[PDB]
Amino acid sequence: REIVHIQAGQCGNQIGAKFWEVISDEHGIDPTGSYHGDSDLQLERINVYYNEATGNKYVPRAILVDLEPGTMDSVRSGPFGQIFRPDNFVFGQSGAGNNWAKGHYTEGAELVDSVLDVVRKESESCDCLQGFQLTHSLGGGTGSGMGTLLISKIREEYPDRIMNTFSVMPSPKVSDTVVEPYNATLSVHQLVENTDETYSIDNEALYDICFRTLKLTTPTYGDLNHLVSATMSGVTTCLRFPGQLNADLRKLAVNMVPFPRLHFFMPGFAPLTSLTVPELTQQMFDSKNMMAACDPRHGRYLTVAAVFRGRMSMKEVDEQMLNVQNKNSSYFVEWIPNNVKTAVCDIPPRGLKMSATFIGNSTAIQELFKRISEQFTAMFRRKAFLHWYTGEGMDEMEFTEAESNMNDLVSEYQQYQDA
């Protein structure tokens, strides 16, 4: 019925700035100005993502947190820079460190309040606030560190409303900080306890989709950001358009998750780069085409929501959806009955006549976690770089205490491949 957006940490902010302008285009928003488009639907659900100010204008419900100027002036001097409300920006000044502890304890909590102080305004302005969503990196500190904290402060203020995040689980290729495993694990723990759904976007997948299938040679943080932005568009749609269901994001959660701990979705997209229905369906259910690095083969689907875009007859969408539950009949847990629902929205994305998007509670996800915790316990081994955290006032055993907690979540997804 109305949602806010936190967008913290470079990787996070960069994801969001793309996010914002793709969805801003769908609706039709100038740099500031309101509407310019021959479509009409658009502004029925603009409510959800755009608190509106006097005159024309539309301004997104957006909070931007960072622990350095750097990546903020990057938005304000770039795409749809002009658009976010001035003191809706929360500057860091300090270091960010690429060190979870800094972001979660010292240099981060440091700030926290001036952030909460803004979320409080938007939220207590929202006529019936649904919940928040947040985008950020998992390895590297400002986004993952403060972010996990943020939510641990959001919940408690708002236990109440629901809790959504696109967090980008990181990989040993296309990354920088030897440390990321540490950072990620520490956050993984935090998330499992405090969110209601988390989209697991793997950079490992993301980079693979570019070079394994695109011929994209030297992939920027740019092309590759492109996927995430597109994926988030697809994912959000039903919150922000039609009048099909109406999608509570709460409705989404309760339906999508059997067990409280296991709120981890791998997403996935239709067409890609910078389409027929059938060729659209098995492209969205293709492994080599997931947003997370697993293979929805080893590991069955708990439950799956899916969403199709662009005026085409769904008399065919049923016929095909219903097909891949037989052409793959094995790989949907028989103990949750009709565990695939799909919906259709008839207004295409930026470019493209026909799209589709996949939301996926798969235990295939276990694959992802397991692979990070395997270069984590490979590092916490003879206690490697740990002294960067030890020293900031963190505990020796807090690390093992997260290992252990994550290591559980692995063996719970395993636990669900049952009868």
Binding site: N246, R250, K251, P258, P260, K315, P337, D418
Partner: protein, 428 residues
């Protein structure tokens, strides 16, 4: 005497919206409330409407939903004028697809206001009869709030029958995964506060729209129109006053033989698409699983009370010779201890259908209400889903979440177990 409608839940509501519409066209009421048709003063169609002010004709209805969205559509497109702004209640935050929520958490709040407004309507009734509660079986407020309502209605209204029109949820046209839970959850609280209950299998209706109506992939407002008709044919009895079925006890005094066994099986007569059928043929149509209205099969289960509700241009002279031959070339199937039924109700009022609708204008339509023991096919087809989720506490936690109890889930299913046994235990 009088007769209040209650519609709770997105389904509940739309079903209503689209049979109130049908009531109107059947009673020649222009959306603008006024009827140059006979008139009024403040009998006959008074059963369902109150003659408000001097011009208008308001329904005796309340519409509740815990989101606006659906109720807002009503005060949007004509009929906007029909109801009174108060009769439509809306609750800001959703039910979110769970009984728990509707009944305890987000329901707790709105119930006092709805129960009041109902009384306002009951207040201008010199002898109000009952309540027709329309609601979704699975689905959030339809299960949870409807339940809480009936308990309370049962307290603020002693005798006063309650007739529920449930929408039994179907794989293909569904919202929620947790549907089974809600269905079996509500149905349990719900069952001992209700008098007789018309189930409507969404599947069944969607089936009819595919065989008989030719609609490739049917809408909600496609199905709704069809439900409209059936309901309109059931309410028909007491909206003109017609030969048999003449009040709310007497109408059902007929159907339910035991405090439990409420659920009769409906079967609309001739359904055919615009762009005549014989009294005989349409009778013999009422016996056919395809024309049914809860996907089952009563050729295998027995019958315990049967009711032919005709509408239109018909002399009993045939209805007789028609029943007659339904007995000689078919499946008799009547239980041990009960005459062999066929209370027969003729209303001369020829059936009008929605103008730019899907169906055509008919000369004669039949309705057949039956209390078969085979309607418990639905009762397990539901349970089995339930059983097999709960067997892993599949979604349970969301309910304990809004503050329910593990044990309630046990002790609600433990009641369908009972019912399922009750039913099949009526066999010869």
């Amino acid at each position: 005497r009088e007769c209040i409608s209650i519609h709770v839940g997105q389904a509940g509501v739309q079903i209503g919206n689209a049979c109130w519409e049908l009531y109107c066209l059947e009673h020649g009421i222009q959306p603008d409330g006024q009827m140059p048709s006979d008139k009024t003063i403040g009998d006959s169609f008074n059963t369902f409407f109150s003659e408000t002010g001097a011009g208008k004709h308001v329904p005796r209805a309340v519409f509740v939903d815990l989101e606006p969205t659906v109720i807002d559509e009503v005060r949007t497109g004509t009929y906007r004028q029909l109801f009174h702004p108060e009769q439509l209640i809306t609750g800001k935050e959703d039910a979110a697809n769970n009984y728990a929520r509707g009944h305890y958490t987000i329901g707790k709040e709105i119930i006092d206001l709805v129960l009041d407004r109902i009384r306002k309507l009951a207040d201008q009734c010199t002898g109000l009869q009952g309540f027709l509660v329309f609601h979704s079986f699975g689905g959030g407020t339809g299960s949870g709030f409807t339940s809480l309502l009936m308990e309370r209605l049962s307290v603020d209204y002693g005798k006063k029958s309650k007739l529920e029109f449930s929408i039994y949820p179907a794989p293909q046209v569904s919202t929620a995964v947790v549907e089974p839970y809600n269905s079996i959850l509500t149905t349990h609280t719900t069952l001992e506060h209700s008098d007789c209950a018309f189930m409507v299998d969404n599947e069944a209706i969607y089936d009819i729209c595919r065989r008989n109506l030719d609609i490739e992939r049917p809408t909600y407002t496609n199905l709704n129109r069809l439900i409209g008709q059936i309901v309109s044919s059931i309410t028909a009895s007491l909206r003109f006053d017609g030969a048999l079925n003449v009040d709310l006890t007497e109408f059902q005094t007929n159907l339910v033989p035991y405090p439990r066994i409420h659920f009769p099986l409906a079967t609309y007569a001739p359904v055919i698409s615009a762009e005549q059928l014989s009294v005989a043929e349409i009778t013999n149509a009422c016996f056919e699983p395809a024309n049914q209205m809860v996907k089952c099969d009563p050729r295998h289960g027995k019958y315990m009370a049967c009711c032919l509700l005709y509408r239109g241009d018909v002399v009993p002279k045939d209805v007789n010779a028609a029943i007659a031959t339904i007995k000689t070339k078919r499946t008799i199937q009547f239980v041990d201890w009960c005459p062999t039924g066929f209370k027969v109700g003729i209303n001369y009022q020829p059936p009008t259908v929605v103008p730019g609708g899907d169906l055509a204008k008919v000369q004669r339509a039949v309705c057949m209400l039956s209390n078969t023991t085979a309607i418990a096919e639905a009762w397990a087809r539901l349970d089995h889903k339930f059983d097999l989720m709960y067997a892993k506490r599949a979604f349970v936690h969301w309910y304990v979440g809004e503050g329910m109890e593990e044990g309630e889930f046990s002790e609600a299913r433990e009641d369908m177990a009972a019912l399922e046994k009750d039913y099949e235990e009526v066999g010869v």
